[PDB]
Symmetry: D3
Amino acid sequence: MRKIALFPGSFDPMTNGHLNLIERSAKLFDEVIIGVFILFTPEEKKYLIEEATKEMPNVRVIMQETQLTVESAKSLGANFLIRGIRNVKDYEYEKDIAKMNQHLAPEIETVFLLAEEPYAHVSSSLLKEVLRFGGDVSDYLPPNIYHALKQK
Amino acid sequence: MRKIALFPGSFDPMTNGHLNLIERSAKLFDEVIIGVFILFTPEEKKYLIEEATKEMPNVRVIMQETQLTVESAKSLGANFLIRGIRNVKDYEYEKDIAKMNQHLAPEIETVFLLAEEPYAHVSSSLLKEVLRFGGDVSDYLPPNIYHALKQK
Amino acid sequence: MRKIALFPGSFDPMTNGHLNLIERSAKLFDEVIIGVFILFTPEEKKYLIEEATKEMPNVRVIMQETQLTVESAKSLGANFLIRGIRNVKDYEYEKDIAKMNQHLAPEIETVFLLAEEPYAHVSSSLLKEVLRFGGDVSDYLPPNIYHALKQK
Amino acid sequence: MRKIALFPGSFDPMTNGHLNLIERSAKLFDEVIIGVFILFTPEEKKYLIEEATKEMPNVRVIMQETQLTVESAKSLGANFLIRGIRNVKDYEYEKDIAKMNQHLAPEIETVFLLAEEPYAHVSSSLLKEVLRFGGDVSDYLPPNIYHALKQK
Amino acid sequence: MRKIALFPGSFDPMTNGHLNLIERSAKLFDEVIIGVFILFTPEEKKYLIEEATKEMPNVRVIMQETQLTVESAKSLGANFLIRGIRNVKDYEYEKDIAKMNQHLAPEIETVFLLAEEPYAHVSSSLLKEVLRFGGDVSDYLPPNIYHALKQK
Amino acid sequence: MRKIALFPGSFDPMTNGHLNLIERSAKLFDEVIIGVFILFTPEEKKYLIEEATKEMPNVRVIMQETQLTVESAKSLGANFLIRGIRNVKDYEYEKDIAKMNQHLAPEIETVFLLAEEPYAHVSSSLLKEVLRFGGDVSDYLPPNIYHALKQK
Ligand SMILES: Nc1ncnc2c1ncn2[C@@H]1O[C@H](COP(=O)(O)OP(=O)(O)OP(=O)(O)O)[C@@H](O)[C@H]1O
Ligand SMILES: Nc1ncnc2c1ncn2[C@@H]1O[C@H](COP(=O)(O)OP(=O)(O)OP(=O)(O)O)[C@@H](O)[C@H]1O
Ligand SMILES: Nc1ncnc2c1ncn2[C@@H]1O[C@H](COP(=O)(O)OP(=O)(O)OP(=O)(O)O)[C@@H](O)[C@H]1O
Ligand SMILES: Nc1ncnc2c1ncn2[C@@H]1O[C@H](COP(=O)(O)OP(=O)(O)OP(=O)(O)O)[C@@H](O)[C@H]1O
Ligand SMILES: Nc1ncnc2c1ncn2[C@@H]1O[C@H](COP(=O)(O)OP(=O)(O)OP(=O)(O)O)[C@@H](O)[C@H]1O
Ligand SMILES: Nc1ncnc2c1ncn2[C@@H]1O[C@H](COP(=O)(O)OP(=O)(O)OP(=O)(O)O)[C@@H](O)[C@H]1O
C-alpha cells in the first residue's frame, strides 16, 4: 500500500530548507503531508505553504490542532515521520523526539534527511532575526513567502 | 574523603532516570542526599521523592533554600556532587558547571554516571510536554509520582 | 523515484543492528538491496545474510566487488542509499560521505535511520573484539551468524 | 592596508574571557573595535569596557545601536569579524552566524580564536548566576567591572 | 557494594592526566587498582607507576594480560570501573564501552571523572609525538616517569 | 609587529579546501607560509603547491624536515599558526594540538578559519578514496594538481 509520511513543523515561515526536504521527501514517499502544528496566521500560514508546494501533486498541507505528532500521523494513516538534521544540535534534539515517538507509537518510523549544504545554516528563527534588521534573505525563502514576509 | 554525595536537581517531576541514578549512586556512596533546589512545589516533591526512594536506607531528601550547590554541599558535609550525562548537550553543560563548582569549592568532587539507555532520552520537560497532550509516559515515572501527576 | 534502496557494507559479521535497519527499511522501500562489498568467505556471507533476512520478501542480498557505492547503486537500479547513525561520530562521518555521493550522483538520495537504542553501541569491530575474548554477545547477532561465528 | 576587526558581543558584563580575546586579537589585527550590540546604562557599559582596555592603543569601543553586525563592520571599514569558541555548542552557533554573515557580506571574513583554558567555562550568564548567589567570581572579571558590579 | 575500583589502561606512558584521576579516585574508593594491560617492559612500568603513586596507601598496581576488562575486574574483586572523559570524542567512545561492559557484567558500575583543564588535551600518544621531536612535556609527566622516559 | 602565518599540513594532495584557506588568510596576514611537512614527493608537492598559488604575492611554499610545528614557525618568523575546522571532529583535534602548541610556545597564536560550505566535506583522503575508484573530483582539486594526479 501507499507509504505516507507526515512532516511536522512550526513553519513560521516555511524556508527553502523545509521546501528542499519536502521536494526530496516527495520522491521517497507516495504522499507527504505537511503538518503545520500550531508567529503567523494559520489560515494563510497554510495558504503560503500550499502556494509554495503547488508543483508537487503528492504533497498537501494540513493544520493540526495541538496534539501529539504521532496521534496526528495515526489518524492520517502516516506510518512515517520525516525530519531534517542540519547539525549536531538538531541530531541530538531529533533523536530524543524520535525515541519518545517510538515509545508512543512503535509502528511509526522516523526517517531522516540531512540538510543540503546551501541551507544547513538556515532556520526560521535566524531568518526572522536577519529580516528584523533589513538583511536580504530572499535566496532562503520561497518567493511567495518572501513577498508576504515583507508586509510584517 | 567521607563518602557523602549530594544529587542536586529540579526533580520537576522526578523520573525513572533520576531514580536510576540514585539507585546506582546508593551502591557507591555511604550516603546519597537528594537536594531539591527550589512548577510542582517543594514540600510536595520531597514527600514524593522520599516515597519513591524509601527502599534505600542510605538515601535521604532535603529541600534546599536556593543557594550555590557547593555551599549546600558543605553544610550537609557532602564531598561529592553526583551528576548524570545523557548526551553531548548534558556533557558540555555539566562540564562548565563542574568547572565553576571546582573554582568555588576545589575540595568537592563532581562524579558522573551515564544514563542507562532506556532513559537516555528522558527529561522532566519532555515528559511534561508529552503528558500535556495525553501521552502515556507511565513507563518513565515512579508509580507514586505518575498518579500524583495525574491531578492535571 | 522507484523505491529501490541499497544498504552497503561489509557485514563481517552482520549484527542485529544492521538487521534492525533492514527490517525498518523493508517497511518503506519496495526493494532493499543488501550490498555486501568484498572475516568469512563471500559465499558464506551471502548464505548467512540471506538466512538472517529470509523472512523479508522485499530484501535481496547481492555481493559486489569494492567500488564507488553510487556506481554499485546505479548498476543495481537503486535510487536510495540507506545509512544508520548511532552517534555524533557516525553522523559527521556519514554526512561527509553523503555529500560526496551527492556530488558524484545528484540523482541518488541518501536516507538516514537512527540506531534503535539497544544497538546504538553495537558495531562489528566492538563485537569482534568482545568475541576474541569469549564475551557473550549472542544478544547482538542473528542466531545463525552467532553459531557460524563460534564454529570458526 | 589596515586589517580592522569588529568584535561584536553583548558583554553583560564583559569578562576576562572577552578580555583575553581582545588582547589576543589586538596582536593579530591592526585595529580592534569592540561593538556593544545592545543592568547598568550602556552609557557606562562602554566606559567599563573602555576602562578595562585602556592599556591597549589599537582597541576602541563603540555602541552600535542594534543593526546587522556586518552593516556595522562595513561602515567602519572592518573587513574582519573576530569570534571566540569555548566548546561545541559555541562552534555550531558561531558557524551558522558566520555562514549567514558570509551570505550578507561576502567580503567580510569571520576569524575564530579558541578560549584559553582557564576561561573555557566562562560566560557572563554563568557568572551572573554565581554572583546572584554570593559566589566569588572576582578572578573571572576585570577588577573595574567586578567593583562596578557589586551594586544593584 | 565494596568500594573497590579498577582503573584500566595502557599507561604508555602514564601521564599527569592519569595520575590526576587516580588521586581523585583514591578519595572516592576504599581501594583503587591500576590495571596495566600489556615502550617499557611490564616490570619497568609497574615500578614506574608504583613509584608515581607511592604516596597513596589505598592504591595498588596490578599487571594484566589483555582481556575483557570486566573479567579482570571480577577476578580482582572490583565492583567499579573508573574512566576519564576529556572531550566529546572520549565521551562517545567511553559511552559505547560502558554499555558493552554493562551488558557483559550488569553488576559492575562504570564511574566517570572529567579531565581537569590543565590536562584536558593530554593523551599518552600526543605526549609521545611531542617527545620524539624534543619538545618539553615534563609538566605533563610524573618526574620519575619523565626521567625514565628520557633514557632511551 | 608584522603578521606572518605558517599553514602546516600534509597536502597529499592539496585540495581546493586548502587553497580556500590560503586565499582567505592571505588577506589577513602579511605573509602566509605553506609548510609542507614531508605518499608524494616533496619537489613535486612544492612545485604543485607553488604553481597552484602562483598569483598570490604574500604566499610562500616551504617544506620542513619534520620537527615540532612551533619550532619550524619560530624559525620562520611566524607568530601565527593558521588552521581550518570542517566539523566537530576537526575542532576537537585542532583544539588539543593548539593547547599543546600554546604550552610549547605561548608566544605563538593559533588562528582558525571555518571551512566554507562547498568544501566542508572535502579531505585529501576522502578524495583519494574516490579518485582510486575513478570518481570525478575535479571540482575539488586545483587543475594542475588534478592533471598531475592522472598519471599515478
Ligand atoms: N534548512 C533546513 N535544512 C534541513 N532541515 C531543516 C531545515 N530547517 C528545518 N529543518 C527540519 O525541518 C523540521 C521542522 O523544523 P521547524 O520549522 O519545526 O523548526 P526550525 O527550523 O528550528 O524553526 P525555528 O528556527 O523557528 O525553531 C525539523 O526536523 C528541522 O530540523
Ligand atoms: N533520564 C536521565 N538519565 C540520567 N541522568 C539524568 C536523567 N535526567 C536527568 N539526569 C541528570 O540528573 C540531574 C538532574 O537534573 P534536572 O532534573 O535538573 O534536569 P532535567 O531532567 O534535564 O530537568 P528539565 O528537563 O526539567 O530541565 C542532571 O545532572 C541531569 O543531567
Ligand atoms: N547498531 C547499529 N545501529 C544502527 N546503524 C548501524 C549499526 N551498525 C551499523 N550501522 C550503520 O549501518 C551502515 C553499515 O555500517 P558498517 O558496514 O560500517 O558496519 P559497522 O558495524 O560500523 O562496521 P565496523 O564497526 O566493522 O567499522 C552504516 O551506515 C552504519 O552507521
Ligand atoms: N570565556 C571566553 N573565552 C573565549 N571566548 C569567549 C568567552 N566568552 C565569550 N566569548 C566569545 O566572545 C563573543 C561575545 O560573547 P557574548 O558576550 O556575546 O556571549 P556570551 O559570552 O555567551 O554571553 P552570555 O553568557 O550572556 O550569553 C562570542 O563569540 C563568544 O563565543
Ligand atoms: N589527561 C587526562 N585527563 C582525564 N582522563 C584521562 C586523561 N588521559 C586519559 N584519560 C582517561 O583515562 C583512561 C585510560 O586511558 P588511556 O590509557 O587510553 O590513556 P590515553 O592517554 O588516552 O592513551 P592513548 O594515547 O594510547 O589513547 C581513559 O578512560 C582515558 O579517557
Ligand atoms: N576542505 C577544507 N576546508 C577547510 N579547512 C580544511 C579543508 N581541508 C583541510 N583543512 C584544514 O587544513 C589543515 C591542513 O589539513 P591536512 O594537511 O590534515 O589535510 P587533510 O585534508 O586533513 O588530510 P587527510 O584528510 O589526508 O588527513 C587542517 O587544519 C585542516 O583542518
